[PDB]
RNA sequence: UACCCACCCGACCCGUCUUGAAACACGGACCAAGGAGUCUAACACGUGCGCGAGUCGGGGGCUCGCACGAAAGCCGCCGUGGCGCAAUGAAGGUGAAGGCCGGCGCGCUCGCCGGCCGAGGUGGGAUCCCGAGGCCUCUCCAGUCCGCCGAGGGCGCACCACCGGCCCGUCUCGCCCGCCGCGCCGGGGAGGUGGAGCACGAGCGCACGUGUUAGGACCCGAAAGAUGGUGAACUAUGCCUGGGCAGGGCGAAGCCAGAGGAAACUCUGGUGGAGGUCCGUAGCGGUCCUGACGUGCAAAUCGGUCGUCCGACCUGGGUAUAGGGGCGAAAGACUAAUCGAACCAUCUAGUAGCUGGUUCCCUCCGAAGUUUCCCUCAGGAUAGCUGGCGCUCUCGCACACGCAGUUUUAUCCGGUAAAGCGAAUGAUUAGAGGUCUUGGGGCCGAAACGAUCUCAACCUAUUCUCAAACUUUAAAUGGGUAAGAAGCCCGGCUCGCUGGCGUGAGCCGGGCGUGGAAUGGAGUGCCUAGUGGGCCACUUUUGGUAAGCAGAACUGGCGCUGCGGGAUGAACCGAACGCCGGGUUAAGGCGCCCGAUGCCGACGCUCAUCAGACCCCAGAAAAGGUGUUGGUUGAUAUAGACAGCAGGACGGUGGCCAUGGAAGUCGGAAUCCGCUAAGGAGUGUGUAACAACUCACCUGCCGAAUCAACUAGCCCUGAAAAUGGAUGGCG
RNA sequence: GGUGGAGCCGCCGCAGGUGCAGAUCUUGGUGGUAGUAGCAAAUAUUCAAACGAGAACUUUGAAGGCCGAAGUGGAGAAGGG
RNA sequence: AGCCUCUGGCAUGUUGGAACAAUGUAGGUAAGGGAAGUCGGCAAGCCGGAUCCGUAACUUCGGGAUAAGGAUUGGCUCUAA
RNA sequence: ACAAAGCAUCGCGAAGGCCCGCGGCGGGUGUUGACGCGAUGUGAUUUCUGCCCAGUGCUCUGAAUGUCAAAGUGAAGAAAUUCAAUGAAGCGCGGGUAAACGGCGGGAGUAACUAUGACUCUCUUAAGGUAGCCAAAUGCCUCGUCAUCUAAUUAGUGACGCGCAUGAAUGGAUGAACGAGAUUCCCACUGUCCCUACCUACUAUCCAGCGAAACCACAGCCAAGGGAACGGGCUUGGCGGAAUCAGCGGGGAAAGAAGACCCUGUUGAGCUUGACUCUAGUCUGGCACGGUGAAGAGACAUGUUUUUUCACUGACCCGGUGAGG
RNA sequence: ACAGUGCCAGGUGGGGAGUUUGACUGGGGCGGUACACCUGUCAAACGGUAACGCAGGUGUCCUAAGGCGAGCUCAGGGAGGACAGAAACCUCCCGUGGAGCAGAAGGGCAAAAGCUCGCUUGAUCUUGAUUUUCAGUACGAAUACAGACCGUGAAAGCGGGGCCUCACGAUCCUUCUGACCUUUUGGGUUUUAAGCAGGAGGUGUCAGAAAAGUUACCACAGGGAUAACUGGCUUGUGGCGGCCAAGCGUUCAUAGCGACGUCGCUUUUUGAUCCUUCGAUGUCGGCUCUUCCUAUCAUUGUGAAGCAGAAUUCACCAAGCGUUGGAUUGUUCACCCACUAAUAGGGAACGUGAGCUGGGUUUAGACCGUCGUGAGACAGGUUAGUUUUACCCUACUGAUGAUGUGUUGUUGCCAUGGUAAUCCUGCUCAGUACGAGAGGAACCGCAGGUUCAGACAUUUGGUGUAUGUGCUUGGCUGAGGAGCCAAUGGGGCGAAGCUACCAUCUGUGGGAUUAUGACUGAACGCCUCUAAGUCAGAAUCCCGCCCAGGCGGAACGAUACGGCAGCGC
RNA sequence: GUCUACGGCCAUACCACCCUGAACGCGCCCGAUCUCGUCUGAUCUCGGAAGCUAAGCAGGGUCGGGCCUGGUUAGUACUUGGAUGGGAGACCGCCUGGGAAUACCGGGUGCUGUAGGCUU
């Protein structure tokens, strides 16, 4: 009672038949991995952002009509 | 079309397990009727329907003697209750909200008080809305109606990716607490991490399908185990009571006479009739023919021959011992044709990873023999491979992104083939060179690196040959990425990390489109059967001598698959099959079987007393062969060769060694001149040695091509096996 | 078309013990084998008559024979009924 | 005992007829040779009753033993006991 | 083969040995008593019965300072408890036993041919195979060597014995009588054979009558080829003429039986023991029924406990009888 | 006051019960462990890959053989230096690693990872993430971080075991440690127990059963997935045969041989392998019988010889016909005796069991030896042990027939099959050839034999149931006579008929050539058996005689008087 | 032209020997009081500035060894695909593409980075 001990065979055709795939990869991919200390930080990074939206909010209305003046000095 | 018959071509018997079945594998004489994936419960997903944060359904109840009813209808019962509406901790238990703004505590990324919004944001997002601009309309212009195209811009479902946030458990760290009590009281924060969580829901009930189980469980199938029972009419013993065993042989004790002797007693002749005694009927048994018979007269009989036949003999009836028990002069024998453990019924449809079977058509899709784990190796589990169900989108609706058993263009990765060993490591030959060192022997030396050798080991330049477990080098095929919108380029905010400043990352805000060739609609989720014995071929390759052997790689097949071809044939060559008419091919073919050369086919090769005749494939080797045909190279030659026929083949010379004979000649050192024309101090014949003969060498005659070694083609030799015989046959 | 003598099918839905070639399948039936193997253990029958539709096989007579009194003879047990 | 017969009992033991082939199964017999046969003298045949003679090794002194080996055997007419 | 007489061990004086039974104050041996019963071994007679008690058993008025439980007693604690002392049988230790199971070895030198070795050295163990016997039913090498028997002998008989692997009641050696026991040889005999022949009966054969069965996919002429690697069928050849009778044993890998061998199965049974887990039975202790009286002693304590011994008779037990002194 | 019974405790207990007695495995068993791991290789340059493929290693060891930090330099060699030499100690020079780094190898390592010192516990406490085997699960092992507490160093840094790749272990259970933890349930306090979180006690079959045998008394489910026959493939081994040629052969390679080497055939040896068969193909020998092969032992014909004759080896055409009788043995195989012309070798499912036999293997009974505590085991012996069925189809052997030929009969032909004869002695040749002598042939003839075919019965023999005829035993017919019965009463002699190397008779001819030897005669102005041509030539082959007579013919005869006929031209 | 300090790539830089170095530096060098370390001020640590390019270092030189690059070896060895190509087989040829390594010949022998000198 001998018996084939191993072997790849036909398992070429096998795994190709649905065409191996490389990993389908989105933007934003998982922070899950990062090590904690730039976690830790960029968190409070994230957490006030908004402190400080006033600053951003004039002074992007500061470029946008700079802006509107230059395609308008350009007009 | 169906009945019978005829013909040409095709054609092996089905089912099955199987790498492979027409099989010298098994089931199958034939025909009828019967005959095998069921029901229940429990999950799971899909689907249909009712209602929907609810929704039932049961048990009850209220309504009938039912005809239809043991139905239907109805009930704050309808929620007692289940399931859902909420999680998380072992548990005590806690328990899903954040944002924002203003005000007040020091805005301290901390604590408290008033107001607003309420499930956060980013990127895609079916997609609706808004729409610059076009596109006409019989005029120049005016102008409201109608749409088509529509750059660009907005809301953005579902879903996916991500960042945030909240609940609980645990940790870390740290702050302030509230006070019906005192704080080994309770309460809040920041950061990480465990969770089957929340983040404005989707369940319940009822159907049907598929799948997995528990059930006898797709049908049939054990050897067994258990509980109760019935048997000694067979046979095994014991007991009780009955019945039976011709005729002969040997001849024991006892006894009687006679005779000896002194006595003990001993002889001789009788009697006598003992014995698990002999022959041998009846009886009981069953040795040998390995006879008869062997679908018998017989589920063990029949003949001849045999054993025993007054005793541990044979028997009849009665009675005892009953199943892990009996009984055994003991063979595991016998116990009612059954015995290494009875028969009967039940538990029982015992269990089976193992055989066998498994019932109508058509249509579409279509495998595996591999992965890891297993008391796993005939089985499962999980991977794959398969199908079904869908969904999300794309846009051939003049207006596409995406992917890929591709290839380019860049760019990294590699240690195999080859190569090398005057590069390492490991082997290894030779010489030259070296008292390298040194030696061990020598020979010439008292001894002496003195001389000359020698061999050993080393090493200085060299040289021969090697390595799968060696490597300076170093391919081919091959493996990664990359070839843009998730991309670039500006502007600006945030940080508890990082730092002299800046880094870096994160955010918001704007500015800009086809980025190599060729192909094609892509993405994603659920259930899930079968399979988990494989086999063959090119190339690579491991054992083995080799195998139709064992074991890998890579692809392809066969299994799963027919057709043309290979005579025949799984797997070779072509080529993959809906049913047909015409044409044309592939691999193969084209004397005849047998479609096609019934070419005025080319050019050659070969004759076999064993011819040769097509990938897999089925037959042969070294070695030969003036058999014939080509070459190759070297020869020879009109100063006349080659061959043929005629003359010489000698002298210096019994040369020297060898004497045993070698004056040329068993053998060898050799070993050259004279006559020269030419004769080798000899090719051989032989002769003890010569001679004699002959051959090289040279001549005489003849008239032009000849000779030798190799090499390859075909045919021959080498070539021997058994029922007659196979280029498929004829030929 | 025929024979047969009393019930039966189409469509829309529901329910199944629902389709057989096979399991050394079950039951029943029937072949080929085949008018074959066979009707061969213990020596043996023959003649005439009777009866009768019918006689190798019954019955009677005659003849030849065997069992041969440890019987194929005459009576019983158990068993049979 | 076997073999033949009286007494008694049967009718060749689930059939008959025609033939004498091969193989058989049962029985028989063989010239010369005699175990050369075969694994082996398997089977068969040699012996066989009685009377008269005769009897070994060995021995547990009982046996061996019917050891072995020889002779005789009818019918008739007598005789003796 | 068993049995057997015989020989031999072994237990046991009856509350006994062996043994049955589910249980009783139950039964067998036992209507018994050591010349009896039960348990084994060898196997008449003759002649013998050798060494070994290390191993495993069995057993022993045998020490149980080894261990060792239930209860029992002691101590701490609040209590479950915990910790102490002690100690039965068997186990450990020590005697005996082989007619219990069984065991009974290996090296060198050395004598006046050679060889062999009386003799002498080590080593080991529990003794190291003694009397005998052997190529035996026991011997691998093996057709051992010699002789005998044959023309010729792996056969037979007889001797030889470093005997793979003989041997003393797992009995050794013998051996008259006996044997449907196993061999070998000789005489006689023979169809066993050279070498077959004929004769008889019953068959078979044919006929009248009567009539089965196993078996059967389809079936039935061969060579070679291929093919699941030995075809009847397929390819190519060879060929083929109705319907049958007696024979026949080449073929149908003929029938008969889901191979008895072998291997697998997480399928069994029978038997074994040093397997695992248990059990009836039995040995020992404790507790209970279990009392009365007597002495006396130790230990602890300053009564308790342990109780040792000797009595008693009411439970209980056995014995006898027609319950008679 | 114990016996004894009732109940608990310890011991003993194959007397009894139940059960187990691994897997892999070129069948299994015994051997190994490829059963968990690790190196180098195999492995075909990414990774990954098999076998009881190689070459090896592990179940460890370390209080430093770890962590830092310094500080140096190793193996080996040369030259020196009192005892001191190939080796102690010192000094200089050379020294890419030729040392060392606990261990296997492989990588890695130089003001190091090596060696020497000083200071030490990063071998500590704690979340996650990832890699490695991978299902992309664990365990093990590892890699980066982060948070604490530290060690070390001026410091940058380094360090959570050992320079890298191996050195290890689930559930359940047990124990230890941790928190003023939780539960211990109607409250409360203490014990006690249960949780929670980490370690340990272990499964080596290493994803983890608590486990000895035997069966020859055996059973069942299966298996040609797995042996023991045959057959295939293969051909080591076995057998048979070539090539080269150093040598043997007095001389001389090749008459006969032939080393060192090398190429093949063969399936009569054994193996390997496991394709076929396990709902069974009857598994050794011998007996009988046929046929076939030639790798020729004899005989016919020949060539060779170290061939004078005789004898004998070598080779060619050749399988026509031969190849025996016995002793031992189960044997195949073997050995001998004896004969012969020779005692060649083989195939046909290792031909042949519905052909035999059953001696050997190989059931159950027994016996010894060895082994085993035992049941039992033993290619160790030994004795006893059932051998079935044919009537079916085919083949074969005989036997009737069959369609055709108008019907019949007679005499015939021949297609095709079959085929058969064989060897020896004696005499003569001749004591001749040859030889020196010893020795010693042949062809032609003649006489016979062996083996084998075909007959046959005159004689000899065998049988004999003419139941022919005598002779006899027992009985039976009253006796004589005549007979009968006793599975053929027994025995003599016996006709016919069958029948025997146990009697007798008969066995027959040509053709074409093989091997071989020759002729003419080329290629190759010679020579050649050959290339074209010819000749002799045999147990061979074919035919003749001999046997059969075809879905093959031939010639000739007679052809239905009839009462009904019917035809032939 | 050049050095010193810290370097990058790590031999075109190494090794062996030969020749030449103005000035700044680098060095040799001179001492052991303090710091520090040794058996030894040899090295290391420290205080120095009398001498010299003797050496390191720099720079050159060698028909130098080595390395670095080309040529040749060679379209050779090997190889992706292909055939009903050859061959008894070993193997070999061709088609479609890719394409090495020695021996043997050439050429080269350190490029630079920042900060400071010197040649003012
Ligand atoms: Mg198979
Ligand atoms: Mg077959
Ligand atoms: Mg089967
Ligand atoms: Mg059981
Ligand atoms: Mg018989
Ligand atoms: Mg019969
Ligand atoms: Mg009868
Ligand atoms: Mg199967
Ligand atoms: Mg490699
Ligand atoms: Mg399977
Ligand atoms: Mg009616
Ligand atoms: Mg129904
Ligand atoms: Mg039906
Ligand atoms: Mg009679
Ligand atoms: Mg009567
Ligand atoms: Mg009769
Ligand atoms: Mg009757
Ligand atoms: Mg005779
Ligand atoms: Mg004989
Ligand atoms: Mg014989
Ligand atoms: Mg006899
Ligand atoms: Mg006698
Ligand atoms: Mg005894
Ligand atoms: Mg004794
Ligand atoms: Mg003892
Ligand atoms: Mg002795
Ligand atoms: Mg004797
Ligand atoms: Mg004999
Ligand atoms: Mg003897
Ligand atoms: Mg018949
Ligand atoms: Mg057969
Ligand atoms: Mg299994
Ligand atoms: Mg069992
Ligand atoms: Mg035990
Ligand atoms: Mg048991
Ligand atoms: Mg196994
Ligand atoms: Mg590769
Ligand atoms: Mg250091
Ligand atoms: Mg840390
Ligand atoms: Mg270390
Ligand atoms: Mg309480
Ligand atoms: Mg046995
Ligand atoms: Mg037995
Ligand atoms: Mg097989
Ligand atoms: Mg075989
Ligand atoms: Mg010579
Ligand atoms: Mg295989
Ligand atoms: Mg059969
Ligand atoms: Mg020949
Ligand atoms: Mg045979
Ligand atoms: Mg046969
Ligand atoms: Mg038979
Ligand atoms: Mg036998
Ligand atoms: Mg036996
Ligand atoms: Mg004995
Ligand atoms: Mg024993
Ligand atoms: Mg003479
Ligand atoms: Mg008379
Ligand atoms: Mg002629
Ligand atoms: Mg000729
Ligand atoms: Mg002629
Ligand atoms: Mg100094
Ligand atoms: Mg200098
Ligand atoms: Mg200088
Ligand atoms: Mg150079």
Same mark, same amino acid.
């Given at each position: 009672?001998?018996? @084939?001990?191993?072997?790849?065979?036909?398992?070429?055709? $096998?795994?190709?038949?649905? +065409?191996? =795939? %490389?990993?389908?990869?989105?933007?934003?991919?998982?922070?899950?991995?990062?090590?904690? @200390?730039?976690?830790?930080?960029?968190?409070?990074?994230? $957490?006030?952002?908004?402190? +400080?939206? =006033? %600053?951003?909010?004039?002074?992007?209305?500061?470029?946008?009509?700079?802006?509107?003046?230059?395609?308008?000095?350009?007009?």
């Amino acid at each position: 009672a001998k018996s @084939k001990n191993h072997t790849t065979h036909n398992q070429s055709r $096998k795994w190709h038949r649905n +065409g191996i =795939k %490389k990993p389908r990869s989105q933007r934003y991919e998982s922070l899950k991995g990062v090590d904690p @200390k730039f976690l830790r930080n960029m968190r409070f990074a994230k $957490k006030h952002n908004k402190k +400080g939206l =006033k %600053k951003m909010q004039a002074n992007n209305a500061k470029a946008m009509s700079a802006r509107a003046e230059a395609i308008k000095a350009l007009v």
